[PDB]
Amino acid sequence: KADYIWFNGEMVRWEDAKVHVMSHALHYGTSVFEGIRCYDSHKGPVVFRHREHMQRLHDSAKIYRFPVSQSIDELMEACRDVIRKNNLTSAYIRPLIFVGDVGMGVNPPAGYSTDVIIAAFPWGAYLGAEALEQGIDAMVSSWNRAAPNTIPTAAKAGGNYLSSLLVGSEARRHGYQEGIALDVNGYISEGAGENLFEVKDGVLFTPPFTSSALPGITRDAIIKLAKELGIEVREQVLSRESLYLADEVFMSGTAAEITPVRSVDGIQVGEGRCGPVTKRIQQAFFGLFTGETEDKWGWLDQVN
Amino acid sequence: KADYIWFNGEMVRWEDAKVHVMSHALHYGTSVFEGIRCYDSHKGPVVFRHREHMQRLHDSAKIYRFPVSQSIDELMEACRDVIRKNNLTSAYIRPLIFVGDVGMGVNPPAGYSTDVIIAAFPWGAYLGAEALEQGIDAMVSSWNRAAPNTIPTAAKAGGNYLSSLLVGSEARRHGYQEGIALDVNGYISEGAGENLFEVKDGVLFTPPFTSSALPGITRDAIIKLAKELGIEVREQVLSRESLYLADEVFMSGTAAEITPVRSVDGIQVGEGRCGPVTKRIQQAFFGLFTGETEDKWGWLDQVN
Amino acid sequence: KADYIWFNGEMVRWEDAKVHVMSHALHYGTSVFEGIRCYDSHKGPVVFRHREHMQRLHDSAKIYRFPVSQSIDELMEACRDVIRKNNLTSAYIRPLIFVGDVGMGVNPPAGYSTDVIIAAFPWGAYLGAEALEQGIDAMVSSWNRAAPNTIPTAAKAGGNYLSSLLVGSEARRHGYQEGIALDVNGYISEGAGENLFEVKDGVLFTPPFTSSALPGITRDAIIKLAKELGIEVREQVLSRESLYLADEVFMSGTAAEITPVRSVDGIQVGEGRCGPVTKRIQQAFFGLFTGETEDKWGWLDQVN
Amino acid sequence: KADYIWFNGEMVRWEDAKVHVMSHALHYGTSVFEGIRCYDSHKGPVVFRHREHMQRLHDSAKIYRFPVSQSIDELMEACRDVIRKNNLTSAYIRPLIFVGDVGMGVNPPAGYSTDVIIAAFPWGAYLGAEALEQGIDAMVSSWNRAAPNTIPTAAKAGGNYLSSLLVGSEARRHGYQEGIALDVNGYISEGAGENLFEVKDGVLFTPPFTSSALPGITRDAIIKLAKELGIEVREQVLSRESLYLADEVFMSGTAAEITPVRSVDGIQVGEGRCGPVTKRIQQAFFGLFTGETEDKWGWLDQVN
Amino acid sequence: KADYIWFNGEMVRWEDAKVHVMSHALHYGTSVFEGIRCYDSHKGPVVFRHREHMQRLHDSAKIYRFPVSQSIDELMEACRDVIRKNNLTSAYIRPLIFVGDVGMGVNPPAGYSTDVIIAAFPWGAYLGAEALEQGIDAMVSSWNRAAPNTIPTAAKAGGNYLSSLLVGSEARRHGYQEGIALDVNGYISEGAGENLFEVKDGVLFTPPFTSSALPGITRDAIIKLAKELGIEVREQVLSRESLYLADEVFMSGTAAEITPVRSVDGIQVGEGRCGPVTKRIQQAFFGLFTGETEDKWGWLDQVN
Amino acid sequence: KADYIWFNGEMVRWEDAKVHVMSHALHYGTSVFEGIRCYDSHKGPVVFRHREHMQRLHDSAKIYRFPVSQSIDELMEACRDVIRKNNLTSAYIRPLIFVGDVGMGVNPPAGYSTDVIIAAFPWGAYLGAEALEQGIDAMVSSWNRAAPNTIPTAAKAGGNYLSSLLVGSEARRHGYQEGIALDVNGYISEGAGENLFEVKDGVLFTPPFTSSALPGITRDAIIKLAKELGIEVREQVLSRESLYLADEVFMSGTAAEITPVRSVDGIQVGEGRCGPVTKRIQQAFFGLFTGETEDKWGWLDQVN
Numbered sequence A, B, C, D, E, F: 001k002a003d004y005i006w007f008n009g010e011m012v013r014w015e016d017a018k019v020h021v022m023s024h025a026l027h028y029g030t031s032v033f034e035g036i037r038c039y040d041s042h043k044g045p046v047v048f049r050h051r052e053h054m055q056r057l058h059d060s061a062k063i064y065r066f067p068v069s070q071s072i073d074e075l076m077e078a079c080r081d082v083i084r085k086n087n088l089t090s091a092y093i094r095p096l097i098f099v100g101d102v103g104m105g106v107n108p109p110a111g112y113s114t115d116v117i118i119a120a121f122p123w124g125a126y127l128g129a130e131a132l133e134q135g136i137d138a139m140v141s142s143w144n145r146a147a148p149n150t151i152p153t154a155a156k157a158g159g160n161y162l163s164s165l166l167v168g169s170e171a172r173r174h175g176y177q178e179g180i181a182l183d184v185n186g187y188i189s190e191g192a193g194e195n196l197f198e199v200k201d202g203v204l205f206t207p208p209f210t211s212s213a214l215p216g217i218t219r220d221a222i223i224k225l226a227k228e229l230g231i232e233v234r235e236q237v238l239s240r241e242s243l244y245l246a247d248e249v250f251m252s253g254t255a256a257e258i259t260p261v262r263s264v265d266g267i268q269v270g271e272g273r274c275g276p277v278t279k280r281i282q283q284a285f286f287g288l289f290t291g292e293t294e295d296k297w298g299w300l301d302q303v304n
């Protein structure tokens, strides 16, 4: 937790950041949000692919026509502002744009405005203390990801997560660390809160957005790092069983970073440990914050 | 609006009913809710199909495994309690069960509890002041309803409504009063916040739940009233074009009650006015609150 | 062929009934049509379910918003007029409403009118001189019927038949008399030019319109006749293999009347002949024109 | 209109180019056609990708097994002839091969032949006088494109256009200039009479033929011009929402040439004007008719 | 195991019932089989719905065109013989028709014949010693049932069971007793080796064959017993979540007879024990073997 | 046929290699197998891509969790052993891993083991003595391939072939030599027993595994050979009609090697003969056994 939360421009004490129970988003899933990480690097506290995240936040809101009064630059400034205000050097940031207290009825009244929050706070490995190192055990879920043209899966919206709750909770109830969901066609989509990658014969594979997968920013970074490392990348639909035949499997995400998947549905992947290509990518990723990996794309935004 | 809102057992002043901005449901659409109407009848203030609604609220929570500490009877008592406390004789009630301030991450921590709210307040015709009388103009949306086995459509959950927002807002932007959505198969599903009925050759038609339609309680009541009136009812999949060939078309819902649809995509239905069968059902429905229609199923719960 | 064709309100000799090659319908399938039969009866020449066919014609046009200047009564008089002008007592009637010479570009110019033709002529059994009596060999096509919400299959429009051509020609090229098509879901739809019926344990089955089957008027009469005969009817989705397990199988249509199907894909149906139930239904149908079957629905329109 | 139309090997006068009202294609949509443009250029009148179009015309007929007695070069010579004979230096050409007066019944009799017509005439911007410059407002339709294996969308056949009528008329009735359709999967297919392109981060995107999109000749030309300009091209499935996130959006076609799309469903694309990449491509395209763009592929067939 | 097995017309000893390892069915899953139970009753040993099973065995072979040289009565006599010869009064019978040693290559050579085997042996409760009484815990599988028109699910064929292996083994590995599978549409199909029934508000529900469910003989018997008891039955598509909302849930099958399902995916069904309606049906079922339930349909074939 | 068959570690004379009729695989399609060819070469007898085939065998088993006691090296030695024991220099090898006599009930008892067979024998061209040289006539089947996530199509398992039987037998009954199946989406999948390739404008196309196509080892070698030849390869979804527009079409498989397809559904492909590109590829393939083609990948395993 932390001392302050940026709320519609103001730095509000954490406990005072409250909204009415009749706020639209509590009843209709009408909000869009982001996950952003601030790392303690060789260059000091830096926000990873900051602009990319605020840009996606805007894109998500645009799809639903949620009015956003803050520009991308102003959102970035607020983000850096809230990190410094809480005196954090590393943290997870949660920007949230939502339809507030505007009356009942799924359709908000014409002229309404959205409320915006940006909370920063320390947050450990999404999948566990040993996850990044030893990998996790995944399970293919019995629940499928949203079908195309129902609820936009390119958008990171609150309502989307009922699905992730069903997928993620099932895996956990059965003793697994994360669930992998298939789209409505029976092909691999993504993890409950991560994108899915496969490594086969030295080539990196990952499903396209049209497989109902979120256009992950970690995913995109990985694809770019891989090309820098001379690793071929193929964005293509993947069969459910490809998970059992792949040489390596790993998940990506802002919270999950790069987490090796050592088994799927109880079937061991490779030697049951982090794969060689997964390790190259993982080191190349965390090397961005030690200076070992040259930031050629401009992904480290100085907090100050 | 009103003076009080029932909140976790307590009667809280409306303006004091607030939750933290880090409440789970604001970020992940993790809530289930209901729409219930209290009518000023010949028997005094009565809650229409009260138990049925609280039962559905419980069912929705069960599907997502949201822990609910209140029993159906206790929820009903709270509902009647909040109506009387606000001294209302007619009103719309909004029970809401949601995952509150329990930490970030789509999967709530083991042992967590849900927060529950029940707000009562006057609310007019969902589709307009002239809707019930003259009917409304509907449009078939370009957005489809959630596919089976993605997010349960039998559950009335907050996250579901991103879809209803897209469907409903599109119709309104194009000058229509409500949008009718098709499921992922191209068949009629339901309205953004209503169930859809068709009348053809004296027979009543409506899509099954498997057409991604909510198991409406108004819908169910209509099917029962129709059988009492000697009207044949067929719950079956319906083609998109059946809307243009039906003799009558109408939508049903707690907020929308029974609203005639005089046109679809600009094509006039019948004489462009309330249809004869729609009128019989509408009169039989509102007759429940004047004593004209005998309450044979026990649908009027006395508020007191 | 015959001597005269009703063309926009006037009797034109057959040979002079022509249209410009830049007629819309020739380039964009923009026409709707019907198939009607006139039968010799105890009441003299009678058109079978005349009004129902003209109503469907009107419905097909309505779906595409093709403006139709003729009323249903006017089209009915014109049809009876062409039957008499050609000195026919029995015949096949082909009404055709089509977008004419209005310019290129799929969307016709505002304020356009449609051209209308009604040709009547003798036409033998749709599937053969021995079809009604001995049955036919059918084949399940490798081409599927139009998917829901692409082109309305409840409409009888010209453009629809490219599919019928693919399905029908494939059956014929492989040695069969007619093809049966499956919908995009893999279930039985209809024949290239007729509806499909199955008989099993004394019960009659036929796919609903949502299985991409045209709402056949013959189909409808058979269902109504069957109920009179005390035969149970079930309109439901049917599996492809149900064709091989049915006790009987037959096709219905204005042109094909009631044609038994002795085999499907080379697999013999029942004894390989017109089954007993198909027989009961066929005698009841043709009985309408002898008076042996009472015309309880008012299906025989006298030509005079 | 013009003065001559090529009709079955002979240059007949416009007013004489007629066929019987009982012509097959008028009742069953059994025709295949093309759209070709003749441009006035720095080299006089030139037919754009003349052979390619006549080849597709042949390909379309082949899929439906429509017999074609003319060779590609004879059609090309006839086309060139119609342009000259009518004294046009810029025009739109419409070759049409159709099943004519061969008798009723969807299956044409063995040994029949097709009638062939080729009309040429002046035709302006398909989507408006200001289209090419300012861009147009597009709408995603509520009607879907033909599903795979129903009616081959690889072929340009008359019957295909009932769908294009529904898609295009809907957008026009709602105040847009063109409608974009999704396939039965919920992915972007194509415009009612154009192919769809998106530009994102400098890369050009367009759906594959398997997304129920016609293998456009303008589309193919653009892909080739793009690569020549060093612009990366990706033929891949695209989500419905990608239309709101693309930096640029444009439609391609013979009639529509290269038309920018400044907004989709009311959501502004980029700056609301022609984007930079669409600009380069459009200039390269029209540069062919001035010599500025070297015709490296031989896409210009001099009329003479 | 037992002492004799009927093999191609002769009662061979168990140990001699062998076929070559190059038998077609061993490599291509080309066999059709059945499951039948012989019960000890108030009338001695009786084979339940004996003829029905042998008829389905024939139907299965017919779909795949496997030649069967034995008539239904010869199979019935052989079955009765195997039971007697082995001195059993209660047992499980397994008739199996398979393509034997006819050479490699999926297509058997013209004129081949099938090998037929019929083994009888004592087999207890399919889902456990406590199944029938206490009910079992079911799990919805992550594997889907065969899609329509791929491998006919109306037939009980060997190859079909790779799917049942995946569905059933997954539930068992996760600590459940049986897995319930959804079809490719996301709707309930059937258990890995049983049909699925739900009870809601006194009405009995079960998916149709078109939901990729086998036309179970126990299922059919239950529908008939239900109607006799005045219980309404609805054969209709069912949503995945309906399993959590049903008042009662149970599985049917020859091996599993009538087994209550006390929980699905860990969610308790009703009171967590056999429900009242499942109770009535189960008693009516087993009442057949005591005389309590009058065999009104002739489902008991005395062994003698 | 031959003299000996490797059976669980020992050479058994062909005639004595038998199994009990209660062997699991005979009743539930529970086996996985391979097809391998041994060729006479300049290096003497050589098994083509031997290890790759045994690896796939292992992969097929892994997917179903069938326990396999033999290592890949052990299976390879056994295969070479049976080739020599039978005095063969060229031959077809059939390894078969199957669940044996372990009891009835789809789920085998914990701790079970699988039986393994490896038969080697001479086998002529899969599709005919003139197939490789003159090509074959193919037919698009009316039966579709297994849907994703039902039965893994990446596996070569016995149960899979019920589908291959339906597709292959249908082509053969209608006068063709092989059938081509479409997946549940309506796109080209593969032949009943081989992968499908198309050639268009010098580019080679073939469906990905997600089109329900087996990851053919011949397919893989052709793609690798093609790249050596400087031929561009595109693994992508293909439309059904693309078969009629391709310049060339051929099938690949261990048994069928490289078989040109001269016609599809009676529509001639190219000149009606082995196209030039198919030719280049075919000569490169067979060149491997003459040495004319350098074995750069290590595909020739010497039998010795």
Ligand SMILES: Cc1ncc(COP(=O)(O)O)c(CNC(CCC(=O)O)C(=O)O)c1O
Residues within 6 Å of the ligand: A034, A035, A036, A164, A190, A191, A192, A193, A194, A195, A213, A214, A215, A216, A217, A218, A219, A252, A253, A254, A255, A256, A257, B104, B105, B106, B107
């Ligand atoms: C469904 C889903 N897919 C993929 C991703 C990966 O996208 P990135 O852009 O690379 O982050 C996320 C991010 N999800 C989370 C945590 C979700 C939660 O709040 O539980 C994250 O990494 O912030 C996600 O929710």
Ligand SMILES: Cc1ncc(COP(=O)(O)O)c(CNC(CCC(=O)O)C(=O)O)c1O
Residues within 6 Å of the ligand: A104, A105, A106, A107, B034, B035, B036, B164, B190, B191, B192, B193, B194, B195, B213, B214, B215, B216, B217, B218, B219, B252, B253, B254, B255, B256, B257
């Ligand atoms: C998608 C949807 N379908 C059908 C219905 C009809 O169900 P009933 O049980 O008969 O009510 C509702 C209820 N929706 C609303 C209002 C939604 C909103 O809050 O905007 C109602 O009638 O309370 C709904 O949201």
Ligand SMILES: Cc1ncc(COP(=O)(O)O)c(CNC(CCC(=O)O)C(=O)O)c1O
Residues within 6 Å of the ligand: C034, C035, C036, C164, C190, C191, C192, C193, C194, C195, C213, C214, C215, C216, C217, C218, C219, C252, C253, C254, C255, C256, D104, D105, D106, D107
């Ligand atoms: C696809 C199709 N399905 C069903 C029917 C049956 O409907 P009825 O209303 O009972 O006629 C027809 C009528 N087809 C034809 C002949 C088609 C042709 O002209 O080739 C008819 O009976 O007039 C049809 O074309």
Ligand SMILES: Cc1ncc(COP(=O)(O)O)c(CNC(CCC(=O)O)C(=O)O)c1O
Residues within 6 Å of the ligand: C104, C105, C106, C107, D034, D035, D036, D164, D190, D191, D192, D193, D194, D195, D213, D214, D215, D216, D217, D218, D219, D252, D253, D254, D255, D256
């Ligand atoms: C559905 C459709 N998609 C794409 C295209 C684009 O293909 P091009 O090869 O690049 O032309 C066309 C051509 N349609 C038209 C106009 C349709 C009409 O006749 O109204 C054309 O450009 O001639 C089309 O009809």
Ligand SMILES: Cc1ncc(COP(=O)(O)O)c(CNC(CCC(=O)O)C(=O)O)c1O
Residues within 6 Å of the ligand: E034, E035, E036, E164, E190, E191, E192, E193, E194, E195, E213, E214, E215, E216, E217, E218, E219, E252, E253, E254, E255, E256, F104, F105, F106, F107
């Ligand atoms: C997939 C499947 N569904 C339903 C049924 C139920 O049909 P009934 O006709 O009522 O039996 C069975 C029969 N299966 C088994 C056992 C399967 C096995 O061999 O393990 C049976 O009851 O013999 C089945 O295999």
Ligand SMILES: Cc1ncc(COP(=O)(O)O)c(CNC(CCC(=O)O)C(=O)O)c1O
Residues within 6 Å of the ligand: E104, E105, E106, E107, F034, F035, F036, F164, F190, F191, F192, F193, F194, F195, F213, F214, F215, F216, F217, F218, F219, F252, F253, F254, F255, F256
């Ligand atoms: C469905 C299927 N697809 C593709 C292939 C091609 O894969 P390859 O790895 O290149 O062999 C085969 C192999 N089938 C056979 C023969 C099947 C039969 O036994 O009838 C083969 O080539 O051994 C197959 O069965």
